[PDB]
Design a protein around this nucleic acid. Structure first.
Ligand SMILES: [K+]
Ligand SMILES: [K+]
Ligand SMILES: [K+]
Ligand SMILES: [K+]
Ligand SMILES: [K+]
Ligand SMILES: [K+]
Ligand SMILES: [Mg+2]
Ligand SMILES: [Mg+2]
Ligand SMILES: [Mg+2]
Ligand SMILES: [Mg+2]
Ligand SMILES: [Mg+2]
Ligand SMILES: [Mg+2]
Ligand SMILES: [Mg+2]
Ligand SMILES: [Mg+2]
Ligand SMILES: [Mg+2]
Ligand SMILES: [Mg+2]
Ligand SMILES: [Mg+2]
Ligand SMILES: [Mg+2]
Ligand SMILES: [Mg+2]
Ligand SMILES: [Mg+2]
Ligand SMILES: [Mg+2]
Ligand SMILES: [Mg+2]
Ligand SMILES: [Mg+2]
Ligand SMILES: [Mg+2]
Ligand SMILES: [Mg+2]
Ligand SMILES: [Mg+2]
Ligand SMILES: [Mg+2]
Ligand SMILES: [Mg+2]
Ligand SMILES: [Zn+2]
Lengths: 183, 307, 46, 201, 98
RNA sequence: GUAUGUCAAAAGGGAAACAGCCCAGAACAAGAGUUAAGGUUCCAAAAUUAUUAUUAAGUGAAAUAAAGAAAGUUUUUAUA
RNA sequence: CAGGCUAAUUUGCGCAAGAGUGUACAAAAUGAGUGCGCGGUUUGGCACCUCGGCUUGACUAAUCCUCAUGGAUGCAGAAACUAUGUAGGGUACGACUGUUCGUCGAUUAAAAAGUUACAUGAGCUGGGUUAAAUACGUCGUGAGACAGUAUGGUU
RNA sequence: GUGCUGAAAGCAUAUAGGCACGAAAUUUACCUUAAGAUAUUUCUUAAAUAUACGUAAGAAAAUAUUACGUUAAUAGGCUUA
């Protein structure tokens, strides 16, 4: 029981993560060679990684009943990566229980009305547990079309360097070297 | 979803962070796209609030007999202007009639206090095409705002009819009268199909209910007469509502706007009948701050009986 | 134009082409013939 | 491509200017492919196109030639654009020096054509409008795109001129779209010696 | 028929792997019995018949591991997973030519 | 009818849901225990694990629609 | 009876091949006897289970009219034929019959079909079918009976 | 369905690539209802405001909705046309 005795404040705090839909991802890409062919994370592969963060399943203290999720700010949703002809041949459906009222729309037509942010929300939405926490977790997905967003000051930092910035890693390793000067 | 395709929360405000100047595509939705796909139909000028005063015929000097409705203008003023930078669309707010100060609430008494206009009876917005359709606040609109022969669209609330059956509301034919029919002469009959059709009554099924008392538009109605003294605008045809009800009159959307000379002549007549429209408005706005800050401090009585 | 399930060339000028293929549909196979317009054929329905 | 290997003879006066690999940023795409801006200036005008970067142009000026080459012949995308890029340069070179022309023959009783100005519908100042009487109740008028010169040596003969072949032929196809040649009397608009087999009856 | 027995016509890469390891595990049971008896200079008729007309997993073709013979099929082939108790039954040899 | 099994009288895991199919026979608990069928990006426990090829049609991905057509594409075997 | 499984059959369709007709010429039109299929509308099999009209819809598209369009020695024009898109709207009135169906009169741009418990009877109608009464013909020795006929018959 | 340019494939080709025409279907537009961000140099420190009561109505099964209540034409009466 000792493992759980302590300050659980920071384990349950909400962290503001960030990812760009245009930056190549060596991990979430199907192409790994040459490095110049590494693509960004596809629509569904990005949504599978985001749904894991919204659930907090990446934390060692995860529990499905507790809402221990985090925020995910996604930018550049206009250049969302897709393979094949999904952009023009995929269709989204809608029905309001009235026979004849079937609403269909393609991805390229849906990206013109509500941008690529709505295409990423429907993907993440379907990857979340179908329960009473689905709307809270999905609401923590901040998707934007360009590089601008109102959370440039919320993104997690380590020594003033936002995670994903050029020199955020060396800023983290420099803070852990000082933590070893103690019993 | 809750409305349409968007699953966005109803408290988020990301619009200002999606700008086309950043190289993004112009959305097909929003106030900018909506105003653009209605540019040709949106009128150029504003409308007027008129009262339906009855119906007659217009007799021509050669044999014409045209049924027409009489619409009277009762102290129609310009109360406010809706800009695209403050509200998201162009429109002019128009007033009608008067009202007792005691019957007007405090929120609206201070609303007119900052404009120099007496309390009105009814308010209504008339959308315009661009900023050229905005008029000075505190100018009266007369029947000469239109010209004889101009076609307009009249918008009013129809006559109420309470709970209506299926015959009056939806034009159902009813059933037989004497060939054995049993208690089902004016009934609606079958309400739908059986198990194969859904085991339910489908949405949108036409059924009895309340009728009337809703807005209705009649388009492309010429103006036969224009008299400023009486304050009437005789239009051809019928108009929705009862006598004494307020209606909205504006240029037809399915027609070409009036000539440029007319749109300018009318605008040029407001500067002559009311040469002091900004001086009286700024003066009324300046007094609002004095009285507003007097109410805050609690010294409002010092100004009422100041003289 | 005759919509068949088995389109075939009927002379030396008949050519097989796949037209109306774009980012939305796969298209159809055609039999274009500048000599005889009766050799026009199409494979598949819209 | 047996056409891409053939060198392109640059006649006297024509000057080819090869730009540098550039990538115009696009917010809707994660990776844009570089291109090369190739300018072909000469007496009649200047034409420009943006070719893929993998097409290599060894512009040797001492001999007034320019051969094309691709980085990989086994790729279907590179073989196709290799021949297409060559055919376009050949038209550009032969369009800025000599110029492309299209002749339209109007067959039929009552078919005429005139070239005059219509200042009411001018898209640009001084635009020429080809007026055609093709048996229609209304008059057919079309404005020549900016960069073309339309003339009428005879009432039943039009002569289009321009340095861009695609623009000239595309416009010649719009005028022919009003009266397509019929196979019973030959009435219609024929472009560049176009013909039609008639019926014996 | 209205009762749904959802049985796909082909096996997955996971069922094929376990099938290969089952065919390979039965080869070791016979090899262990055959070698243990050879040390004593003894043989069993069943072991002789198995090693004579039955191949090992490394000698079988992919179509013999994942399909069986069914005269009622248009190509006389049928998914081996459609056999009763296919997991715990030995089936390796089909008629010649099919 | 015959041979074999299950259900009937058998819960549990798998087959989306499932009397009869694939595994496996429930006396009660504990375990990141060891396995079967089955599976391992997310819903959802476990690989976005390795190797070599094919497909560009979302074909397909846990219920194979046919004959047939065709400068779709790959490979092999002849051949210029 | 309806639903379910099936699809021999059909007054439901498609594709493939092409004897033949088309003065000529297979594929404008036409298409013998056939083959490979779809579909679930007709008459059937099994036995898991023990009508028509009126009112008011919804849906399908294998299209009667209206819109765009290819082919047509056999597309001069007009009209029509065939085929490709397309189901937004319309598809009426009357006589006969209990009738859906069907026949006919006269108009019309046209007066096309199908599914939904062969939609809808705790919404109506009850003419058909339809228990007790009665007569007729036929069958039965008879009581009676009949996919018969006729008048009447608590919805 | 019909084109222009144009290669892969020296030709050809409205096939790749780059452009365009084109229907009572679709979308927009048009009309109504819902929606309720937002606006006012708007109001409120125990209120603003709303309801109740009374006279009613452009409203009407109840409810709701929209007015007026003496500094008042809301309904009735009276008078005149
Ligand atoms: K129900
Ligand atoms: K699929
Ligand atoms: K039985
Ligand atoms: K075509
Ligand atoms: K061509
Ligand atoms: K409206
Ligand atoms: Mg009333
Ligand atoms: Mg009646
Ligand atoms: Mg009665
Ligand atoms: Mg249900
Ligand atoms: Mg079933
Ligand atoms: Mg029993
Ligand atoms: Mg069991
Ligand atoms: Mg599964
Ligand atoms: Mg474990
Ligand atoms: Mg997991
Ligand atoms: Mg039974
Ligand atoms: Mg034709
Ligand atoms: Mg429409
Ligand atoms: Mg029925
Ligand atoms: Mg019922
Ligand atoms: Mg009687
Ligand atoms: Mg060419
Ligand atoms: Mg167009
Ligand atoms: Mg305020
Ligand atoms: Mg109070
Ligand atoms: Mg009441
Ligand atoms: Mg009175
Ligand atoms: Zn031919």
């Amino acid at each position: 029981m000792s493992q759980t005795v302590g300050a659980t404040r920071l384990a349950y705090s909400r962290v503001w993560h960030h990812i760009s839909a245009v930056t190549p991802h060596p991990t979430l890409s199907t192409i790994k060679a040459p490095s110049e062919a590494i693509t960004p994370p596809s629509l569904g592969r990005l949504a599978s990684r985001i749904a894991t963060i919204l659930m907090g399943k990446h934390k060692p203290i995860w529990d499905p009943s507790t809402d221990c999720g985090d925020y995910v700010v996604v930018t550049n949703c206009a250049g969302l990566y897709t393979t094949g002809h999904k952009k023009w041949r995929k269709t989204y459906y809608r029905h309001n229980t009235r026979p004849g009222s079937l609403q269909a729309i393609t991805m390229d037509a849906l990206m013109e009305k509500h941008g690529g942010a709505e295409v990423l929300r429907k993907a993440v939405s379907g990857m979340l547990p179908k329960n009473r926490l689905r709307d809270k977790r999905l609401a923590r997905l901040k998707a934007f079309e360009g590089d601008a967003h109102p959370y440039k000051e919320n993104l997690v930092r380590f020594g003033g360097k936002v995670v994903g910035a050029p020199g955020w890693e060396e800023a983290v390793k420099a803070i852990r070297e000082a933590d070893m000067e103690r019993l | 979803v809750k409305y349409g395709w968007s699953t966005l929360p109803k408290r988020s405000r990301p619009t200002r962070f999606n700008q086309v100047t950043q190289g993004l595509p112009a959305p097909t939705s929003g106030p900018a796209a909506a105003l653009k796909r209605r540019e040709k139909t949106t009128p150029l000028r504003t409308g007027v609030l008129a009262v339906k005063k009855g119906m007659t015929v217009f007799m021509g000097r050669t044999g014409a007999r045209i049924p027409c409705t009489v619409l009277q203008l009762d102290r129609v003023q310009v109360v406010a202007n809706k800009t695209r930078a403050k509200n998201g669309y162009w429109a002019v707010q128009v007033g009608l009639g008067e009202r007792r100060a005691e019957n007007v609430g405090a929120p609206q008494l201070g609303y007119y206090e900052a404009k120099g206009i007496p309390p009105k009876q009814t308010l209504a917005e008339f959308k315009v095409r661009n900023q050229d359709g905005l008029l000075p606040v505190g100018v009266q609109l007369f029947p000469d705002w239109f010209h004889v022969g101009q076609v307009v669209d009249v918008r009013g609330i129809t006559r109420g009819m309470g709970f209506a059956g299926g015959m009056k509301r939806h034009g159902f034919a009813g059933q037989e009268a004497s060939h054995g029919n049993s208690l089902n002469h004016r009934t609606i009959g079958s309400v739908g199909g059986s198990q194969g059709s859904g085991s339910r009554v489908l949405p949108g099924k036409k059924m009895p209910g309340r009728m009337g008392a809703q807005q209705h538009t009649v388009q492309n109605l010429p103006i036969l007469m224009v008299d400023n003294e009486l304050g009437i605008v005789v239009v051809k045809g019928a108009v929705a509502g009862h006598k004494g009800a307020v209606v909205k009159v504006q240029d037809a959307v399915k027609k070409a706007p009036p000539p440029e000379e007319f749109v300018e002549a009318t605008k040029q007549l407001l500067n002559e009948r009311f040469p002091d429209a900004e001086e009286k408005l700024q003066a009324a706005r300046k007094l609002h701050l004095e009285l507003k800050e007097a109410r805050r401090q609690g010294l409002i009585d010092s100004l009422i009986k100041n003289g | 134009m005759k919509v068949h399930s088995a389109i075939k060339k009927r002379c030396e000028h008949c050519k097989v082409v796949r037209r109306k293929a774009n980012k939305r549909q796969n298209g159809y196979l055609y039999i274009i013939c500048p000599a005889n317009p009766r050799h026009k054929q199409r494979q598949g329905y819209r | 491509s047996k056409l891409g290997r053939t060198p392109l003879s640059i006649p006297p006066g024509v000057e080819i200017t090869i730009g540098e690999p550039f990538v115009k940023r696009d917010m809707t795409q994660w990776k844009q492919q570089p291109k090369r801006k190739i300018t072909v200036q000469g007496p009649l005008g200047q034409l420009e196109m943006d070719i893929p970067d993998f097409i290599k142009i060894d512009h040797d000026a001492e001999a007034r030639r320019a051969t094309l080459s691709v980085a990989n012949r086994d790729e279907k995308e590179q073989r196709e654009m290799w021949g297409t890029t060559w055919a376009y340069l050949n038209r550009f070179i032969m369009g800025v020096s000599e110029g492309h022309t299209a002749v339209l023959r109007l067959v039929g009783i009552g078919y005429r054509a005139t070239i005059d100005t219509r200042p009411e519908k001018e898209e640009y100042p001084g635009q020429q409008f080809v007026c055609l009487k093709l048996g229609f109740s209304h008059p057919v008028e079309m404005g020549v795109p900016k960069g073309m010169k339309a003339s009428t040596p005879q009432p039943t003969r039009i002569l289009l001129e321009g340095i861009n072949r695609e623009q000239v032929m595309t416009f010649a196809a719009d005028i022919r779209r009003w009266r397509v040649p019929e196979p019973y009397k030959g009435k219609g608009i024929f472009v560049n010696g176009e013909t039609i087999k008639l019926k014996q009856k | 028929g209205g009762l749904l027995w959802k049985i796909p016509w082909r096996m997955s890469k996971f069922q094929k792997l376990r099938q290969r390891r089952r065919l390979r595990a039965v080869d070791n049971v016979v090899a262990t019995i055959e070698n243990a008896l050879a040390k004593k200079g003894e043989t069993v008729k069943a072991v002789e018949r198995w090693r004579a007309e039955m191949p090992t997993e490394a000698e079988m073709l992919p179509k013999d591991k994942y399909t069986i013979f069914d005269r009622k099929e248009k190509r006389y082939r049928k998914g081996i997973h459609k056999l009763p108790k296919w997991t715990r039954v030995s089936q390796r040899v089909n008629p010649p030519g099919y």
